[PDB]
Amino acid sequence: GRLRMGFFPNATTDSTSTLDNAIYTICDIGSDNSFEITIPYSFSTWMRKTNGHPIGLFQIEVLNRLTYNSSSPSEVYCIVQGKMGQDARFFCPTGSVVTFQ
Amino acid sequence: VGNEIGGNLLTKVADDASNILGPNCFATTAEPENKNVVQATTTVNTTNLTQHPSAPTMPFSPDFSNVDNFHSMAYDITTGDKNPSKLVRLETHEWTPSWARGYQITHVELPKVFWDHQDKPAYGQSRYFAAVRCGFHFQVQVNVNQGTAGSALVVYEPKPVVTYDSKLEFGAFTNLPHVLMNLAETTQADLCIPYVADTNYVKTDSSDLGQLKVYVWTPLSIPTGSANQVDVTILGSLLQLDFQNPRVFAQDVNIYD
Amino acid sequence: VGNEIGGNLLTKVADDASNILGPNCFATTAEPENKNVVQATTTVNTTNLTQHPSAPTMPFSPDFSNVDNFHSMAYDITTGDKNPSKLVRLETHEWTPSWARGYQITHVELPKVFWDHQDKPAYGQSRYFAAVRCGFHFQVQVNVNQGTAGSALVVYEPKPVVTYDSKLEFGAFTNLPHVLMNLAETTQADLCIPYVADTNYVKTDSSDLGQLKVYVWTPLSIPTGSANQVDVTILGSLLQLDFQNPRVFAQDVNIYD
Amino acid sequence: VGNEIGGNLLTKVADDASNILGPNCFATTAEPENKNVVQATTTVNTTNLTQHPSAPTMPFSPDFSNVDNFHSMAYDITTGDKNPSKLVRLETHEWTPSWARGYQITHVELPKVFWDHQDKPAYGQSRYFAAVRCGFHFQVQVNVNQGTAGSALVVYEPKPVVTYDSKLEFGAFTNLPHVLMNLAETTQADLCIPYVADTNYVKTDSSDLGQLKVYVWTPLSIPTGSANQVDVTILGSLLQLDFQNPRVFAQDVNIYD
Amino acid sequence: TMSPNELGLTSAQDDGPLGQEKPNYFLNFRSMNVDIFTVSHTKVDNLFGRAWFFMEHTFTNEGQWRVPLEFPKQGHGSLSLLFAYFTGELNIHVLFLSERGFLRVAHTYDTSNDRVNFLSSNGVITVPAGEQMTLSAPYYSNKPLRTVRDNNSLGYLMCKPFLTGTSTGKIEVYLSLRCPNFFFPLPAPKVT
Amino acid sequence: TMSPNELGLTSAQDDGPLGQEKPNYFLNFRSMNVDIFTVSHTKVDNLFGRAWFFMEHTFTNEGQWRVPLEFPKQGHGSLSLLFAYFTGELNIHVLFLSERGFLRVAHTYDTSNDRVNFLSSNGVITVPAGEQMTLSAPYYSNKPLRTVRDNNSLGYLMCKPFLTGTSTGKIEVYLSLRCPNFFFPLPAPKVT
Amino acid sequence: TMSPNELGLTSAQDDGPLGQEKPNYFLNFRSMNVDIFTVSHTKVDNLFGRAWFFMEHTFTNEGQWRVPLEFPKQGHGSLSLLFAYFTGELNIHVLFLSERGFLRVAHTYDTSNDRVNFLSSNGVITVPAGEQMTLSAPYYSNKPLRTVRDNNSLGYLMCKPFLTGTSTGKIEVYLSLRCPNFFFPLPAPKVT
């Protein structure tokens, strides 16, 4: 099956919307079932608050129903990971907003 | 060895026992047309990942130049592209003779005015992007018969100025890109304004780029017989335009913190 | 990178920490013996397509020359092949002395006569093919004691002639490949006939190639005491044979329109 | 051709129709990270076969030398390895003065004595192997004050001798690697014994390598006041050790026929 | 040597792009090209260079005759139905069957009926009664390509006869083309 | 050219070894590095080179104060919790809030309480009342590496004040490190 | 380096052709060849070069004795049963146990009984009473190869004794072959 995951940078309205104009990636199930999507830096400012405005709207819509057979699952599990790009940078160290353990 | 090795043995064994007529058998082994590969295709801000690709097709001896050699449309190929930067009428107003010095004739929200109506060349694209970075080229036109006289102040006011407008001393606005244009002398003013803001990019459909205004330097001195309906028009062109952030159709997106 | 890369890392990492004794681990990665390939084998007018082939086998240090170095069979290796072109008895008939000039002694359907009976060397192959293109070498033999005399006309008649035989003037048949053979002088006649037809190929088991005949040039003048039973025999050999169209066993197939 | 060929056509077709801006599409095809390969890994007497391997992992910029550069343990790196060959106390006995010439003082089962108790350096490994081939270095120590006198016969007796011991003439045992050591003169005897047997290897936990013994050459002549408790100690070191046959933990295995 | 692909083992989903002259073999078989004539009869220029009946008109008076010209779904010209677009010279064969008179003939791709009222500007070659002419109409088409199927794929033909007395008759028409440019072959047609 | 692997299509089970700086692209995207300052604020030496509050102690008498020093789960120093082992110089910032007196300060990694009884051998820099000092304690650790988490990951700090009269006060402490050596990054911490 | 194929991972369906001397390894193992004798005892010429009992016959008179000679399913010669065809010299060891006389011995592959009536033409070496001879019969076989199994795989042996008086006895026979040519090894035999 296929699955299209898009991303509207800097979006705030949490609502399902056509991803035709959003940065999307179509995922066709095969041997390498891990799919990546990059969001390039998008903000008015040169640097952006670490804990400020959202990164954007993340949506993963179904493109083609997950097919199966007598001995295969009718539904599967998915995991979403996140990391910084090779051009990632952090700038000013500020106070803390939370306490770890 | 094996199972790859078979075309050779059969082809050879057939070869060894061959007589005058020749071999009575030929065997060839190779990889299937449908191999275990993965194809990836990327269009504008999109990436299609397929792990079960097939040989792409196309018409006979096709021509993808897509350019009409006959030019049934005699326009620059990049016409549609540059169209949004086209010069357009941003505003029109009729100066009233009674108006005092320093009065604001008319003003235009910058830069969202270029998408003022759905009939604006730039309105189309402006919808699909939340961020904008552009330069302007204004042409404020004011026509008045020779008998009459007067002067207007065409000046560009960045958000900073527009914000604190009342705190600024009129008569000093000449410090901003302006054009004291003396009527009966000039019928049009030209202003080239680059991207000016305290942020790298300005939210589309916003007035953050500041706004162009037209003030009354010296009220209109219209003689008795002379006409009394003077119109002030503001035209705008985009020296350079740049839409970056993608977004839903005309949906308010915050590029700011 | 990966999953191909592992033999090297394990083999290397094992390598890096190695001490005096040596490495304590070796890892090698490669492709399985059973790879994703396709094999194709073609024999006479056949093609076997297999997408799941396996390593072909064969006996120890085998010899596929298939030729008996001792020649327990002292025959030319191509004996079986040429066998069908072998000379054979196509017909035999006893000329009757009473017969008038121009009478037809005997005739043989060409070329289907070479497959006249299942005891004909060419009968075997002729069954598995519908089309034929061949050359002939006839040897009509007629023996008569010296005391007697006479003459027979051995002539080849293509389908055209055989068709319109009654419309042709006897005595002019000498225009066709023939052998006026005067008895008491010659005991055998030789005729080399190439493929003659209005079509590139002739249907197997057909008379389209025409037929060889033997006529009475001048009746037999047999003296009183002399014998009166003269036999006429027709032998045939194939200078060159060619069976092309495949077909079921002895099934009438139409090569013509 | 196909399905491998697609990155090029799409990449090219995209390429051909490209204008000033550039191509509007790029396509690349290749093999998946998870290819059809097989990995094999071998450790000491082991072989792991995997047909569905994955890219091996490891920490950041790792160091597999595994050697502590600070030597928090100031010992030879091969200490643990050689440990089992270490010199150890195999036996101790108190010679009794009354004993007659030729009397057997003490004896040690060879080579199973080096694994005499679970407190023997070699006991550990000796458990995991059924076959052994080694050399010995004995050091029989006997201390006696100067006032006293006497002599003992330290001799190595292979299985052959041990078997037929009563059939051999004492006083001739000097033919075997021995050390007639005269007390009051020598306090220790040294014997270097190589692997001696009628079989290439000896079963571990067996006396097949023969046994070292200590006899009474001449009884102890202990004066009145002198001490009367003389102890005889047997120390053993492995010049060279070799454990080959693998086996369950300390399970009797027959290497012999 | 020969690959299994050329021995029959292939995949239908790997045929694109369109137009793959792949060779097919077996041990006793090889593509053998034999020509029976000095030239090809399959070439578009040759095949179509030969006319084929179109239609007939019977005239009892001078009234003008305008008929849409289209490709045949009937003669050997039907081979054109395998294509989608056409462009090039058009050979029109007209036979004037009459006792005494003249036949004005003209051709235009222009759809407007009025443009044909004044026939002279268009062309109007003259075939005396009892004579037949073959006029080659150029591609004066306002459209770069002519969908090959259209009821007017080919431009309209005009026939007006300048009769003299009560004489009447019939005008048979045949069509052929000079060097034809066909593009984008479409699926084969069905039968009626 | 670009492979499908660098276009997003990959396999999570083929990531080892750890640390793969693989580039990710699309037609309109390329990794662009832009620096806003003349140097990095992500480098361990720089980030940690800046102190952060630790704890405060109020003293009404000279009694000695010994406190385990550990990495913060509170300030920007929390970024250390992403590592497992540490080793290097340790900058201790102490503020002596008092009217009239002196503050003895010393640092040791030694767990034994008794070793700190005679403070002078250990160090004991002197901060006069109303003054603040920044002493850099070396890695006199009996352990090659300091698990970064331990309630005593960092060595113990000793503060004894030589007061003169009834005067009392409070001693605030801040910590920072000079050039830190972190190893074997572990999973990110949870929140309270 | 070493491939996974040589480490144990293989496929039984990819063994053909027959006879693959593939090497098998592990980290502490390598094929080590050690020879205990100056020559091989596995070579066909050597092994079979050593005789083995066949059968015994007791004779009370001169009557001739003909016995089919076949390969043993009993002694070390059984190793021949692993083959299908044989050809080469045949060593026949005969012992004549008698008091006073002579023993005529002859060998022929000819199946006809009559050919052996006149023994002299065939051979008939003479072993005096109490003596034993070893005659090497050539491959005078009318068949290029001798199926190794046949009850007469080896040619028939003839023994006729020219006794003198009432004397009687027994003739023990042993067989061996000189340089044997075996072909097309077949599956191992079963046990009784």
Residue numbers in the entry:
A (entry chain B): 153 to 253
B (entry chain C), C (entry chain C), D (entry chain C): 32 to 288
E (entry chain A), F (entry chain A), G (entry chain A): 25 to 216
Reproduce text from the manuscript describing this model.
Human parechovirus 1 is an example of such viruses that contains 60 short regions of ordered RNA density making identical contacts with the protein shell. We show here via a combination of RNA-based systematic evolution of ligands by exponential enrichment, bioinformatics analysis and reverse genetics that these RNA segments are bound to the coat proteins in a sequence-specific manner. Disruption of either the RNA coat protein recognition motif or its contact amino acid residues is deleterious for viral assembly. Their binding sites on the coat proteins are evolutionarily conserved across the Parechovirus genus, suggesting that they represent potential broad-spectrum anti-viral targets.
The recent HPeV1 X-ray structure at 3.1 Å resolution allows us to answer the question of whether these putative PSs correspond to the ordered RNA segments seen in the virion, and whether they bind to the CP in a sequence-specific fashion. The extent of ordered RNA in the X-ray map is thus significantly less than that in the EM map, but Kalynych et al. could build a model for a 6 nt long RNA (AUUUUU) in the form of an extended single-strand contacting the protein shell. When we examined the deposited electron density map, we found that some of these RNA residues were poorly modelled. The model is an excellent fit and reveals extensive RNA-CP contacts, comprising both hydrogen bond as well as van der Waals contacts. The RNA contacts multiple CP, principally VP3 and VP1. There is also a uridine-specific contact to the base N+2 3′ to the G. N+3 is modelled as a uridine which stacks on the side chain of Tyr21, although any base could make this interaction.
